């Protein structure tokens, strides 16, 4: 059956990637919480 995760790298990055978190106020606050929690990978880039 066709499950929910149908992967695509270009949609992974355009959607949840770094240049797209940095592109706005609230994604920068996301990166700030991931750095502050101290996190090995911030976004999902590769």
| Interface residue list for RNA (CB under 7 A) | 1-11, 14-15, 23-25
Q: How far is the CB of 44 from RNA (least distance, A)?
A: 10
Q: How far is the CB of 9 from RNA (least distance, A)?
A: 3
Q: How far is the CB of 36 from RNA (least distance, A)?
A: 12
The Cα 11–Cα 36 span in angstroms is 26
């Amino acid at each position: 059956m066709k499950r929910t995760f149908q992967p695509s790298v270009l949609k992974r990055n355009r959607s949840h990637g770094f240049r797209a978190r940095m592109a706005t106020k609230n994604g920068r606050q996301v990166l700030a919480r991931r750095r502050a929690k101290g996190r090995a990978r911030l976004t999902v880039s590769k």
